[PDB]
Amino acid sequence: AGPEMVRGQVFDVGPRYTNLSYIGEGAYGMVCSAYDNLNKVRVAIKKISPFEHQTYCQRTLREIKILLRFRHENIIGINDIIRAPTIEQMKDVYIVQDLMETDLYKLLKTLSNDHICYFLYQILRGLKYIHSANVLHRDLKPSNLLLNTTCDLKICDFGLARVATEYVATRWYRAPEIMLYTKSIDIWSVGCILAEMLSNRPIFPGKHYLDQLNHILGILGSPSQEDLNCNLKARNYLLSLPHKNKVPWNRLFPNADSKALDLLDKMLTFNPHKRIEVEQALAHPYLEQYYDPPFKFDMELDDLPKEKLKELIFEETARFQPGY
Numbered sequence: 001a002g003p004e005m006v007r008g009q010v011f012d013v014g015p016r017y018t019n020l021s022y023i024g025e026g027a028y029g030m031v032c033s034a035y036d037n038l039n040k041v042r043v044a045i046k047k048i049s050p051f052e053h054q055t056y057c058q059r060t061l062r063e064i065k066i067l068l069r070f071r072h073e074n075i076i077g078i079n080d081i082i083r084a085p086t087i088e089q090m091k092d093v094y095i096v097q098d099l100m101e102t103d104l105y106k107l108l109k110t111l112s113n114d115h116i117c118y119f120l121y122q123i124l125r126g127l128k129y130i131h132s133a134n135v136l137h138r139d140l141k142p143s144n145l146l147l148n149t150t151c152d153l154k155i156c157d158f159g160l161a162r163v164a165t166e167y168v169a170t171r172w173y174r175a176p177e178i179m180l181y182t183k184s185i186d187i188w189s190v191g192c193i194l195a196e197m198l199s200n201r202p203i204f205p206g207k208h209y210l211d212q213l214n215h216i217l218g219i220l221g222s223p224s225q226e227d228l229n230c231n232l233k234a235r236n237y238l239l240s241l242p243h244k245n246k247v248p249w250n251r252l253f254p255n256a257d258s259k260a261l262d263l264l265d266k267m268l269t270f271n272p273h274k275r276i277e278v279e280q281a282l283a284h285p286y287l288e289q290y291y292d293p294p295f296k297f298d299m300e301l302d303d304l305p306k307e308k309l310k311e312l313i314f315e316e317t318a319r320f321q322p323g324y
Contacts, residue, residue, distance in 0.1 A: 007022055009047070012092070013034060013082055014323050015037070017036055017096070019033075026047075027056075029047035029048050031044055031047075036080075037324075041098075043079060043096050046094065047094055050093075051306065053306070058159075058309060059159030061313050062161060063159045064313065066299070068316070069295075070130075070133070072129040073154075074126030074152075075156075076100070080095075080320050082320070082323055085321070085322065099148075101147065101149055102146070103145060104147060105141070111198075113260075116194070120190075120286075121287045121290045123145060123190055124190060124278055124281050126154070130186070131277075135162070136163075136185060137155070137158065137186050139157055139158075139159065140190060140193065143157075144157040162299070170202075172192070172204050173189040173202075176188070176272075179212075180234040183277070184272035187267050187275055187276060187278060187281070188272075190267060191268040194267065195264060195268070199253060203215075203252065204216055217244050219247050220270050221243075221244045221246035221247070222241075259284070259285055262284070262285075262286065263286045267281060
């Protein structure tokens with residue numbers, strides 16, 4: 001008679017959303033599929049309970065503000081947000097989004113050139129929109145790329161995004177300039193995704209911030225001295241390691257399109273300034289088939305108390321009030 005429940009958890013999504021079933025875990029709570037009785041569509045609903053860790057309030061609020069402003073078919077949107085009518089009763093927040101049947105982290109365990117071409121095209125196209133907002137995503141990876149039955153890709157998880165040192169589970173896709181940022185960070189990640197779409201494994205996994213580096217230097221070998229010149233302690237750590245050389249791209253990927261290795265090569269450039277930009281990557285011959293034609297001082301609450309963040313979250317979620 002009371003609110004619906006899944007796996008012993010309250011999913012108090014009122015009467016508008018019914019027929020709840022578990023579909024996995026988000027960062028800060030459970031994710032369920034549901035039926036939107038008003039718009040007659042199935043949705044995904046993320047339960048988020050962040051109000052007792054300032055970093056979880058921070059990323060939740062940030063992601064909401066970004067997603068409520070972005071509008072693009074390769075970026076997940078927020079259809080609705082459910083929370084209590086009064087701030088003091090608001091312990092939970094439910095974010096309602098289009099139902100995507102899987103993410104790319106799951107999909108690469110069950111690809112094709114035609115598919116990789118389209119996915120990569122959609123990722124870059126979506127990133128084109130993101131960079132064009134002068135936002136840095138700073139967290140791209142296959143699990144943040146939702147996919148539906150009709151081969152449509154959407155980017156999600158904008159918790160750690162900033163306008164033009166934070167723990168993350170398997171921060172493998174973090175760029176190397178991060179070990180000492182700019183939009184180059186995302187192109188690096190995008191490159192690491194193209195690498196994994198082709199090989200169904202992450203060819204840069206380090207059990208530690210040190211092991212990571214060595215997993216990179218085994219492929220693009222050591223860098224130019226003009227790269228060491230481009231943090232004192234950092235460059236010295238690089239000068240202390242035994243030398244290693246570069247590996248041709250068709251050695252690790254002897255089944256990959258040379259067009260892909262060409263574009264892949266231009267994205268996995270160690271130098272963050274020689275690294276190709278998104279709009280040049282879409283223009284690459286590999287994605288020729290689909291080749292057709294600001295916050296600024298905002299989001300700036302990198303350090304606010306968890307109480308005022310609960311205030312801003314309340315304010316930002318007011319555009320969906322009252323619910324059905």
